[PDB]
Amino acid sequence: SMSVKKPKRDDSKDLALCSMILTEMETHEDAWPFLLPVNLKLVPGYKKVIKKPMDFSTIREKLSSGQYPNLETFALDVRLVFDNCETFNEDDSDIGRAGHNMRKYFEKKWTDTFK
């Protein structure tokens, strides 16, 4: 509350660290469904079904241009990638498995870096 602050967590290395995590996800072999925005002209359903599209390239632009206020908002866009994947793909498909793998991969790096 007013004039009563929790001790200050050092957040000066967050930007750098999220960029590292993002690079590691960009270079994973199961990143391919996620590298670029889904073509809304060529994939029936995607536009109407998926209210907030997200992909790694879009995350990378936002991070590089100060569009993440904190590490929580960045983690949200990353999860959104995989939640969208689950909404639109069967678990038993190459893309559905990629999404599950990439989520697991992310959540470990997140925990190992920040918790």
Short mmCIF file of N, CA, C and O in Angstrom, two decimals:
data_model
loop_
_atom_site.label_atom_id
_atom_site.label_comp_id
_atom_site.label_asym_id
_atom_site.label_seq_id
_atom_site.Cartn_x
_atom_site.Cartn_y
_atom_site.Cartn_z
N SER A 1 0.88 -1.21 0.00
CA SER A 1 0.00 0.00 0.00
C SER A 1 0.91 1.25 0.00
O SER A 1 2.14 1.13 -0.01
N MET A 2 0.29 2.43 0.01
CA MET A 2 0.97 3.71 -0.02
C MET A 2 2.09 3.85 0.99
O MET A 2 1.85 3.88 2.21
N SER A 3 3.31 4.01 0.46
CA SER A 3 4.56 4.10 1.22
C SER A 3 4.96 2.79 1.96
O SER A 3 5.68 2.82 2.94
N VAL A 4 4.47 1.64 1.52
CA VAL A 4 4.76 0.39 2.21
C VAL A 4 5.04 -0.62 1.10
O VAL A 4 4.10 -1.19 0.54
N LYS A 5 6.32 -0.82 0.77
CA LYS A 5 6.67 -1.67 -0.39
C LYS A 5 7.35 -2.96 -0.04
O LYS A 5 8.27 -2.95 0.79
N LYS A 6 6.85 -4.06 -0.62
CA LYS A 6 7.63 -5.30 -0.73
C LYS A 6 9.08 -5.02 -1.19
O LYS A 6 9.31 -4.10 -1.99
N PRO A 7 10.06 -5.79 -0.71
CA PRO A 7 11.43 -5.69 -1.24
C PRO A 7 11.52 -5.86 -2.79
O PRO A 7 10.80 -6.70 -3.38
N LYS A 8 12.39 -5.04 -3.40
CA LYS A 8 12.49 -4.90 -4.86
C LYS A 8 13.22 -6.09 -5.56
O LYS A 8 14.46 -6.17 -5.51
N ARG A 9 12.46 -7.00 -6.18
CA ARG A 9 13.01 -8.01 -7.13
C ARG A 9 13.80 -7.36 -8.31
O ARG A 9 13.34 -6.41 -8.95
N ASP A 10 15.01 -7.86 -8.56
CA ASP A 10 15.85 -7.32 -9.62
C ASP A 10 15.31 -7.87 -10.94
O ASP A 10 15.24 -9.10 -11.15
N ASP A 11 14.85 -6.95 -11.79
CA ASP A 11 14.17 -7.32 -13.02
C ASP A 11 14.95 -6.82 -14.24
O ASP A 11 14.42 -6.82 -15.35
N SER A 12 16.20 -6.42 -14.03
CA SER A 12 17.00 -5.75 -15.04
C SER A 12 17.48 -6.71 -16.14
O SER A 12 17.76 -6.24 -17.26
N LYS A 13 17.59 -8.00 -15.81
CA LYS A 13 17.95 -9.06 -16.72
C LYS A 13 16.76 -9.82 -17.33
O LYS A 13 16.97 -10.77 -18.08
N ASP A 14 15.53 -9.39 -17.09
CA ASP A 14 14.36 -10.13 -17.60
C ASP A 14 14.27 -10.18 -19.15
O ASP A 14 14.04 -11.26 -19.71
N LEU A 15 14.42 -9.01 -19.78
CA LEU A 15 14.34 -8.83 -21.22
C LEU A 15 15.29 -9.79 -21.95
O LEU A 15 14.87 -10.55 -22.81
N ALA A 16 16.54 -9.77 -21.54
CA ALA A 16 17.58 -10.64 -22.04
C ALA A 16 17.27 -12.09 -21.89
O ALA A 16 17.54 -12.88 -22.79
N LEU A 17 16.81 -12.45 -20.70
CA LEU A 17 16.45 -13.83 -20.38
C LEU A 17 15.21 -14.38 -21.15
O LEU A 17 15.23 -15.52 -21.58
N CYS A 18 14.14 -13.59 -21.27
CA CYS A 18 13.01 -13.97 -22.10
C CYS A 18 13.41 -14.14 -23.61
O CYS A 18 12.92 -15.04 -24.31
N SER A 19 14.32 -13.28 -24.09
CA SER A 19 14.86 -13.38 -25.46
C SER A 19 15.64 -14.68 -25.69
O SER A 19 15.50 -15.28 -26.76
N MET A 20 16.39 -15.10 -24.67
CA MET A 20 17.09 -16.38 -24.68
C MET A 20 16.13 -17.55 -24.74
O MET A 20 16.34 -18.47 -25.50
N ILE A 21 15.12 -17.53 -23.88
CA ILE A 21 14.10 -18.57 -23.83
C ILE A 21 13.40 -18.64 -25.19
O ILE A 21 13.25 -19.73 -25.73
N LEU A 22 13.05 -17.47 -25.74
CA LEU A 22 12.40 -17.36 -27.05
C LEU A 22 13.26 -17.96 -28.19
O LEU A 22 12.73 -18.71 -29.01
N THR A 23 14.57 -17.66 -28.18
CA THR A 23 15.56 -18.21 -29.13
C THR A 23 15.60 -19.73 -29.07
O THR A 23 15.67 -20.41 -30.11
N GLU A 24 15.56 -20.26 -27.87
CA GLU A 24 15.61 -21.70 -27.65
C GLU A 24 14.34 -22.32 -28.16
O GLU A 24 14.35 -23.45 -28.62
N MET A 25 13.23 -21.59 -28.11
CA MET A 25 11.98 -22.13 -28.64
C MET A 25 11.90 -22.02 -30.15
O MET A 25 11.51 -23.00 -30.83
N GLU A 26 12.34 -20.87 -30.66
CA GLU A 26 12.51 -20.69 -32.10
C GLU A 26 13.37 -21.77 -32.76
O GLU A 26 13.10 -22.17 -33.86
N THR A 27 14.40 -22.26 -32.08
CA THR A 27 15.33 -23.23 -32.69
C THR A 27 15.01 -24.72 -32.35
O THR A 27 15.78 -25.61 -32.73
N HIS A 28 13.92 -24.97 -31.62
CA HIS A 28 13.47 -26.33 -31.35
C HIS A 28 12.95 -26.96 -32.68
O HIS A 28 12.35 -26.26 -33.54
N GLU A 29 13.14 -28.27 -32.85
CA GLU A 29 12.65 -28.92 -34.06
C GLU A 29 11.14 -29.02 -34.19
O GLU A 29 10.64 -29.12 -35.30
N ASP A 30 10.42 -28.96 -33.09
CA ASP A 30 8.96 -28.95 -33.11
C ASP A 30 8.36 -27.52 -33.06
O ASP A 30 7.19 -27.36 -32.83
N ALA A 31 9.15 -26.49 -33.29
CA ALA A 31 8.65 -25.13 -33.41
C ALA A 31 7.92 -24.83 -34.71
O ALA A 31 7.34 -23.74 -34.78
N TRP A 32 8.00 -25.71 -35.72
CA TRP A 32 7.56 -25.32 -37.09
C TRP A 32 6.09 -24.86 -37.20
O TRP A 32 5.82 -23.90 -37.98
N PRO A 33 5.15 -25.50 -36.44
CA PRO A 33 3.78 -25.01 -36.55
C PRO A 33 3.57 -23.63 -35.99
O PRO A 33 2.46 -23.10 -36.14
N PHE A 34 4.59 -23.08 -35.28
CA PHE A 34 4.44 -21.90 -34.41
C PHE A 34 5.27 -20.67 -34.82
O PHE A 34 5.04 -19.58 -34.29
N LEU A 35 6.17 -20.85 -35.80
CA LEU A 35 7.11 -19.82 -36.20
C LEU A 35 6.47 -18.56 -36.79
O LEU A 35 6.96 -17.43 -36.59
N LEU A 36 5.38 -18.77 -37.53
CA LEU A 36 4.73 -17.70 -38.28
C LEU A 36 3.25 -17.69 -37.98
O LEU A 36 2.68 -18.71 -37.61
N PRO A 37 2.59 -16.53 -38.14
CA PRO A 37 1.13 -16.49 -38.05
C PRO A 37 0.43 -17.48 -39.01
O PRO A 37 0.90 -17.67 -40.15
N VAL A 38 -0.63 -18.13 -38.51
CA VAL A 38 -1.47 -19.02 -39.31
C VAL A 38 -2.11 -18.12 -40.34
O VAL A 38 -2.60 -17.02 -40.01
N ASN A 39 -2.02 -18.59 -41.59
CA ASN A 39 -2.60 -17.90 -42.75
C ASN A 39 -4.14 -17.96 -42.64
O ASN A 39 -4.75 -19.03 -42.74
N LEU A 40 -4.72 -16.80 -42.39
CA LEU A 40 -6.14 -16.72 -42.14
C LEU A 40 -6.97 -16.82 -43.41
O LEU A 40 -8.17 -17.11 -43.32
N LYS A 41 -6.34 -16.61 -44.58
CA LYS A 41 -6.97 -16.85 -45.88
C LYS A 41 -7.03 -18.34 -46.24
O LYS A 41 -7.97 -18.76 -46.90
N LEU A 42 -6.04 -19.13 -45.83
CA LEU A 42 -5.86 -20.49 -46.36
C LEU A 42 -6.24 -21.61 -45.40
O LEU A 42 -6.22 -22.79 -45.79
N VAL A 43 -6.54 -21.27 -44.15
CA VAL A 43 -6.92 -22.27 -43.15
C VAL A 43 -8.34 -21.93 -42.75
O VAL A 43 -8.55 -20.95 -42.02
N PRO A 44 -9.31 -22.68 -43.29
CA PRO A 44 -10.71 -22.57 -42.88
C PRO A 44 -10.91 -22.74 -41.38
O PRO A 44 -10.35 -23.64 -40.79
N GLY A 45 -11.69 -21.86 -40.80
CA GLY A 45 -12.02 -21.93 -39.39
C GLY A 45 -11.19 -21.02 -38.52
O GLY A 45 -11.73 -20.47 -37.55
N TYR A 46 -9.91 -20.80 -38.87
CA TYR A 46 -8.97 -20.23 -37.89
C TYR A 46 -9.38 -18.86 -37.41
O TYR A 46 -9.37 -18.59 -36.20
N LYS A 47 -9.79 -18.02 -38.37
CA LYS A 47 -10.13 -16.65 -38.11
C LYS A 47 -11.29 -16.58 -37.13
O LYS A 47 -11.20 -15.88 -36.12
N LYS A 48 -12.35 -17.35 -37.38
CA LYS A 48 -13.57 -17.24 -36.55
C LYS A 48 -13.43 -17.95 -35.20
O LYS A 48 -13.97 -17.53 -34.19
N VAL A 49 -12.76 -19.09 -35.22
CA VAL A 49 -12.60 -19.86 -34.03
C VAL A 49 -11.58 -19.26 -33.07
O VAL A 49 -11.83 -19.22 -31.87
N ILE A 50 -10.42 -18.82 -33.59
CA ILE A 50 -9.27 -18.43 -32.72
C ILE A 50 -9.21 -16.89 -32.53
O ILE A 50 -8.69 -16.14 -33.40
N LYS A 51 -9.76 -16.46 -31.40
CA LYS A 51 -10.01 -15.04 -31.14
C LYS A 51 -8.74 -14.18 -31.00
O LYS A 51 -8.75 -13.03 -31.43
N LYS A 52 -7.67 -14.75 -30.44
CA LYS A 52 -6.40 -14.08 -30.26
C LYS A 52 -5.26 -14.92 -30.84
O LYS A 52 -4.57 -15.64 -30.11
N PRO A 53 -5.06 -14.84 -32.17
CA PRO A 53 -3.93 -15.58 -32.75
C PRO A 53 -2.59 -15.12 -32.18
O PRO A 53 -2.43 -13.95 -31.82
N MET A 54 -1.67 -16.08 -32.03
CA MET A 54 -0.33 -15.78 -31.58
C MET A 54 0.69 -16.78 -32.14
O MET A 54 0.37 -17.96 -32.34
N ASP A 55 1.90 -16.28 -32.41
CA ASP A 55 3.00 -17.07 -32.91
C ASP A 55 4.35 -16.51 -32.41
O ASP A 55 4.41 -15.41 -31.95
N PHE A 56 5.42 -17.29 -32.51
CA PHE A 56 6.76 -16.90 -32.02
C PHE A 56 7.28 -15.65 -32.69
O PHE A 56 7.86 -14.82 -32.00
N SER A 57 7.07 -15.49 -34.01
CA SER A 57 7.57 -14.29 -34.71
C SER A 57 6.92 -13.01 -34.19
O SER A 57 7.56 -11.96 -34.15
N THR A 58 5.65 -13.10 -33.84
CA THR A 58 4.88 -11.97 -33.36
C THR A 58 5.35 -11.66 -31.91
O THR A 58 5.57 -10.51 -31.55
N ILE A 59 5.59 -12.70 -31.14
CA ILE A 59 6.13 -12.55 -29.80
C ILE A 59 7.49 -11.87 -29.88
O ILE A 59 7.81 -11.07 -29.00
N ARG A 60 8.33 -12.27 -30.85
CA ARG A 60 9.68 -11.74 -31.04
C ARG A 60 9.61 -10.24 -31.43
O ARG A 60 10.35 -9.45 -30.90
N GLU A 61 8.69 -9.85 -32.28
CA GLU A 61 8.56 -8.44 -32.64
C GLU A 61 8.16 -7.57 -31.41
O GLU A 61 8.78 -6.54 -31.16
N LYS A 62 7.11 -8.00 -30.69
CA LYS A 62 6.63 -7.35 -29.47
C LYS A 62 7.76 -7.21 -28.41
O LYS A 62 7.90 -6.20 -27.74
N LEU A 63 8.59 -8.22 -28.26
CA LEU A 63 9.65 -8.18 -27.25
C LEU A 63 10.75 -7.20 -27.62
O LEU A 63 11.25 -6.50 -26.76
N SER A 64 11.09 -7.19 -28.90
CA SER A 64 12.13 -6.34 -29.49
C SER A 64 11.71 -4.86 -29.59
O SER A 64 12.57 -4.01 -29.83
N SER A 65 10.42 -4.57 -29.44
CA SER A 65 9.88 -3.25 -29.57
C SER A 65 9.15 -2.78 -28.28
O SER A 65 8.28 -1.89 -28.39
N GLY A 66 9.49 -3.36 -27.11
CA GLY A 66 9.02 -2.88 -25.82
C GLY A 66 7.54 -3.00 -25.67
O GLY A 66 6.93 -2.17 -25.05
N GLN A 67 6.92 -4.02 -26.26
CA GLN A 67 5.47 -4.22 -26.11
C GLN A 67 5.06 -5.18 -24.95
O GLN A 67 3.86 -5.31 -24.64
N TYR A 68 6.05 -5.80 -24.29
CA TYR A 68 5.84 -6.51 -23.03
C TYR A 68 6.15 -5.63 -21.80
O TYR A 68 7.32 -5.35 -21.53
N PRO A 69 5.11 -5.26 -21.02
CA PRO A 69 5.40 -4.53 -19.77
C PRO A 69 6.17 -5.32 -18.70
O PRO A 69 6.88 -4.72 -17.92
N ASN A 70 6.02 -6.63 -18.65
CA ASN A 70 6.72 -7.46 -17.67
C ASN A 70 6.84 -8.91 -18.15
O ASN A 70 6.32 -9.27 -19.24
N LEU A 71 7.53 -9.74 -17.38
CA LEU A 71 7.70 -11.17 -17.73
C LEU A 71 6.36 -11.96 -17.72
O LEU A 71 6.19 -12.86 -18.52
N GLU A 72 5.39 -11.58 -16.88
CA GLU A 72 4.09 -12.25 -16.90
C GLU A 72 3.33 -12.11 -18.25
O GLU A 72 2.81 -13.10 -18.77
N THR A 73 3.30 -10.90 -18.81
CA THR A 73 2.63 -10.65 -20.07
C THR A 73 3.30 -11.43 -21.20
O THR A 73 2.62 -11.92 -22.06
N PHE A 74 4.63 -11.54 -21.19
CA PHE A 74 5.36 -12.37 -22.20
C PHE A 74 4.95 -13.86 -22.09
O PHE A 74 4.57 -14.49 -23.10
N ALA A 75 5.01 -14.41 -20.88
CA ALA A 75 4.55 -15.78 -20.59
C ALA A 75 3.08 -16.04 -21.03
O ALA A 75 2.74 -17.12 -21.51
N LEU A 76 2.23 -15.03 -20.94
CA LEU A 76 0.88 -15.16 -21.41
C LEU A 76 0.75 -15.40 -22.94
O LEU A 76 -0.08 -16.23 -23.37
N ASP A 77 1.55 -14.69 -23.74
CA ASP A 77 1.52 -14.80 -25.19
C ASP A 77 2.08 -16.14 -25.60
O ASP A 77 1.58 -16.71 -26.52
N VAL A 78 3.09 -16.64 -24.89
CA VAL A 78 3.67 -17.95 -25.14
C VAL A 78 2.65 -19.03 -24.84
O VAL A 78 2.48 -19.95 -25.65
N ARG A 79 1.97 -18.95 -23.69
CA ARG A 79 0.92 -19.94 -23.38
C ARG A 79 -0.21 -19.91 -24.37
O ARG A 79 -0.69 -20.96 -24.75
N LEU A 80 -0.60 -18.71 -24.81
CA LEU A 80 -1.63 -18.49 -25.81
C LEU A 80 -1.34 -19.24 -27.13
O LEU A 80 -2.23 -19.84 -27.72
N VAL A 81 -0.09 -19.21 -27.58
CA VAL A 81 0.33 -20.05 -28.70
C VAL A 81 -0.13 -21.50 -28.49
O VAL A 81 -0.73 -22.10 -29.37
N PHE A 82 0.13 -22.06 -27.32
CA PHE A 82 -0.14 -23.49 -27.11
C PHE A 82 -1.61 -23.78 -26.80
O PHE A 82 -2.14 -24.82 -27.20
N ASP A 83 -2.25 -22.88 -26.06
CA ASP A 83 -3.70 -22.97 -25.87
C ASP A 83 -4.44 -22.90 -27.22
O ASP A 83 -5.31 -23.69 -27.47
N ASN A 84 -4.06 -22.00 -28.11
CA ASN A 84 -4.65 -21.97 -29.47
C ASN A 84 -4.47 -23.25 -30.24
O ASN A 84 -5.39 -23.70 -30.93
N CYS A 85 -3.26 -23.80 -30.15
CA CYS A 85 -2.93 -25.09 -30.74
C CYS A 85 -3.85 -26.21 -30.27
O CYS A 85 -4.34 -27.01 -31.08
N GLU A 86 -4.11 -26.24 -28.96
CA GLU A 86 -5.00 -27.23 -28.36
C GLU A 86 -6.44 -27.02 -28.78
O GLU A 86 -7.16 -27.98 -28.96
N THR A 87 -6.87 -25.77 -28.89
CA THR A 87 -8.24 -25.47 -29.32
C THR A 87 -8.54 -26.03 -30.75
O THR A 87 -9.62 -26.54 -30.98
N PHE A 88 -7.56 -25.96 -31.65
CA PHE A 88 -7.75 -26.16 -33.09
C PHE A 88 -7.22 -27.51 -33.57
O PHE A 88 -7.58 -27.92 -34.67
N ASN A 89 -6.38 -28.19 -32.78
CA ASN A 89 -5.77 -29.48 -33.19
C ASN A 89 -6.07 -30.63 -32.24
O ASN A 89 -6.18 -30.43 -31.04
N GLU A 90 -6.20 -31.82 -32.80
CA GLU A 90 -6.35 -33.05 -32.02
C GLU A 90 -4.97 -33.35 -31.41
O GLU A 90 -3.93 -33.25 -32.11
N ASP A 91 -5.00 -33.76 -30.14
CA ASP A 91 -3.81 -34.25 -29.43
C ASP A 91 -3.00 -35.29 -30.22
O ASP A 91 -1.76 -35.23 -30.25
N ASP A 92 -3.71 -36.19 -30.90
CA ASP A 92 -3.11 -37.21 -31.74
C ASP A 92 -2.98 -36.68 -33.19
O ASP A 92 -3.73 -37.07 -34.11
N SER A 93 -2.06 -35.74 -33.38
CA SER A 93 -1.66 -35.24 -34.71
C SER A 93 -0.24 -34.72 -34.56
O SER A 93 0.23 -34.51 -33.45
N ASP A 94 0.47 -34.52 -35.67
CA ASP A 94 1.81 -34.00 -35.54
C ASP A 94 1.81 -32.62 -34.86
O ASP A 94 2.64 -32.37 -33.99
N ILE A 95 0.88 -31.75 -35.22
CA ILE A 95 0.80 -30.39 -34.64
C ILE A 95 0.38 -30.40 -33.15
O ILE A 95 0.95 -29.67 -32.35
N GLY A 96 -0.61 -31.22 -32.81
CA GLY A 96 -1.10 -31.38 -31.44
C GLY A 96 -0.02 -31.86 -30.48
O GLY A 96 0.05 -31.39 -29.38
N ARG A 97 0.84 -32.76 -30.94
CA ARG A 97 1.99 -33.27 -30.18
C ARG A 97 3.10 -32.22 -30.05
O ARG A 97 3.66 -32.02 -28.96
N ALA A 98 3.42 -31.56 -31.16
CA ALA A 98 4.33 -30.39 -31.17
C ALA A 98 3.95 -29.34 -30.11
O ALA A 98 4.84 -28.84 -29.41
N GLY A 99 2.66 -29.05 -29.97
CA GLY A 99 2.20 -28.06 -29.05
C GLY A 99 2.44 -28.46 -27.63
O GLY A 99 3.00 -27.70 -26.87
N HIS A 100 2.03 -29.69 -27.29
CA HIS A 100 2.31 -30.36 -25.99
C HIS A 100 3.80 -30.41 -25.64
O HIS A 100 4.16 -30.07 -24.54
N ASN A 101 4.65 -30.77 -26.60
CA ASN A 101 6.09 -30.81 -26.41
C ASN A 101 6.68 -29.41 -26.13
O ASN A 101 7.44 -29.19 -25.16
N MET A 102 6.32 -28.46 -26.98
CA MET A 102 6.78 -27.07 -26.86
C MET A 102 6.34 -26.42 -25.55
O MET A 102 7.09 -25.65 -24.97
N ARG A 103 5.14 -26.72 -25.08
CA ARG A 103 4.67 -26.20 -23.81
C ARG A 103 5.50 -26.72 -22.65
O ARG A 103 5.87 -25.95 -21.76
N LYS A 104 5.74 -28.04 -22.66
CA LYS A 104 6.52 -28.68 -21.66
C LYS A 104 7.94 -28.09 -21.70
O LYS A 104 8.49 -27.71 -20.67
N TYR A 105 8.51 -27.97 -22.89
CA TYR A 105 9.82 -27.37 -23.06
C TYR A 105 9.90 -25.95 -22.48
O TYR A 105 10.87 -25.61 -21.78
N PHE A 106 8.88 -25.13 -22.75
CA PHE A 106 8.84 -23.76 -22.26
C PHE A 106 8.76 -23.67 -20.73
O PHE A 106 9.48 -22.86 -20.10
N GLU A 107 7.83 -24.45 -20.17
CA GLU A 107 7.49 -24.35 -18.77
C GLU A 107 8.71 -24.77 -17.91
O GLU A 107 8.98 -24.14 -16.89
N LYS A 108 9.47 -25.77 -18.34
CA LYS A 108 10.71 -26.08 -17.66
C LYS A 108 11.70 -24.88 -17.70
O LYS A 108 12.25 -24.51 -16.67
N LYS A 109 11.95 -24.29 -18.87
CA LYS A 109 12.91 -23.14 -18.99
C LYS A 109 12.45 -21.96 -18.17
O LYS A 109 13.25 -21.24 -17.63
N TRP A 110 11.15 -21.74 -18.11
CA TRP A 110 10.56 -20.66 -17.33
C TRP A 110 10.85 -20.83 -15.84
O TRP A 110 11.33 -19.92 -15.21
N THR A 111 10.52 -22.00 -15.31
CA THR A 111 10.75 -22.34 -13.93
C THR A 111 12.23 -22.31 -13.59
O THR A 111 12.61 -21.74 -12.57
N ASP A 112 13.06 -22.91 -14.44
CA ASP A 112 14.50 -22.94 -14.19
C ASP A 112 15.15 -21.58 -14.25
O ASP A 112 16.20 -21.40 -13.63
N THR A 113 14.56 -20.63 -14.98
CA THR A 113 15.12 -19.28 -15.07
C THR A 113 14.65 -18.27 -13.97
O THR A 113 15.44 -17.47 -13.49
N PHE A 114 13.38 -18.36 -13.54
CA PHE A 114 12.70 -17.31 -12.77
C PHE A 114 12.16 -17.77 -11.38
O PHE A 114 12.06 -16.93 -10.47
N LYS A 115 11.83 -19.05 -11.20
CA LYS A 115 11.34 -19.58 -9.89
C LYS A 115 12.44 -20.36 -9.12
O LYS A 115 13.58 -19.90 -8.99
#
